[PDB]
């Protein structure tokens, strides 16, 4: 994904009006890319003990690739949704 | 041969004036009038500002 | 090749008998085609100007240079023993008197 700042300034047109645009408003200047960004980490609840990377029942911050192409498809983990979190807590308590 | 230089007053700070001096010789110190202070005061050379 | 310089527009700006106010330039020159006389000044160009309100007059007056100015002195020394140099001088002859006493009040 590319974020593209618009050079040349759209001249500001009303509440309920489209602002017509010019072939110089078509000129852009890319401010940032979503790529070339600090890689973030995703939260997952583990349904199974995995190696040293996760303890069963616990909520861990994983590398996103690992989450998306291994853990989630293989039923080894689930998203940090508030829904199932409660359930997991309950399970822990029971244990 | 000659350098342009800025000269900064010690008393009556903020007032700077531009003068000539030969490139080969000493950093310049000079008595000169500050219209802020309204008295003559020593200026000291600081930063050359083009050479010629 | 060479230079083609514009005309300099120098010369007399005010002639004898003209009414010339303080500040009016009287004559502009390079070198002294005229010299400053009574109530007439000299700018850095050698340009002559009126120092008071009045009338311009021209006169041929005996010229004595300043002692400190060397070249003139030398010239003077060179001249024979009954010679006097002479030069043209521009004067303003002032018209309106500087002062008039007026009655302010009876105290």
């Amino acid at each position: 994904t590319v974020i593209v700042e618009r050079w040349w300034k759209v001249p500001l047109a009303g509440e309920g009006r489209k602002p017509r645009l010019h072939r110089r408003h078509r000129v852009y200047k890319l401010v940032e890319d979503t790529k070339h960004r600090p890689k973030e980490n995703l939260e997952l609840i583990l349904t199974q003990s995995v190696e040293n990377v996760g303890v069963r029942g616990d909520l861990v911050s994983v590398k996103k690739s690992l989450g998306r192409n291994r853990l989630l498809p293989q039923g080894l983990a689930v998203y940090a949704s508030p829904e199932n979190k409660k359930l997991f807590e309950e399970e822990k308590l029971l244990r | 041969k000659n350098i342009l230089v800025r000269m900064v007053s010690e008393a009556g700070t903020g007032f700077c004036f531009n003068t000539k001096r030969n490139r080969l010789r000493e950093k310049l110190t000079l008595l000169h009038y500050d219209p802020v202070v309204k008295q003559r005061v020593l200026f000291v050379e600081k930063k050359k500002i083009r050479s010629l | 090749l060479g230079g083609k310089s514009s005309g300099r527009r120098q010369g007399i700006k005010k002639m004898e008998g003209h009414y010339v106010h303080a500040g009016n330039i009287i004559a502009t020159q390079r070198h002294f085609r005229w010299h400053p006389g009574a109530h007439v000044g000299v700018g850095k160009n050698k340009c002559l100007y009126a120092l008071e309100e009045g009338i311009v007059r021209y006169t041929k007056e005996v010229y004595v240079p300043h002692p400190r100015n060397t070249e003139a002195v030398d010239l003077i020394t060179r001249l024979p023993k009954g010679a006097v140099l002479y030069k043209t001088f521009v004067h303003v002859v002032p018209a309106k008197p500087e002062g008039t006493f007026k009655l302010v009040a009876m105290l």
């Binding site: - | 008393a11 009556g12 020593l42 | -």
Partner: protein, 41 residues
Amino acid sequence: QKRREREQHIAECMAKMPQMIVNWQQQQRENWEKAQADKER
């Protein structure tokens, strides 16, 4: 505050100065002397 600070600085400078000027004068004199000496040689 701004007015005070700059003003204070200025005052300080003024206080300093009288002797600074003297020093400068002395330096100038010294320089002159040196020049004279050089000329003599």
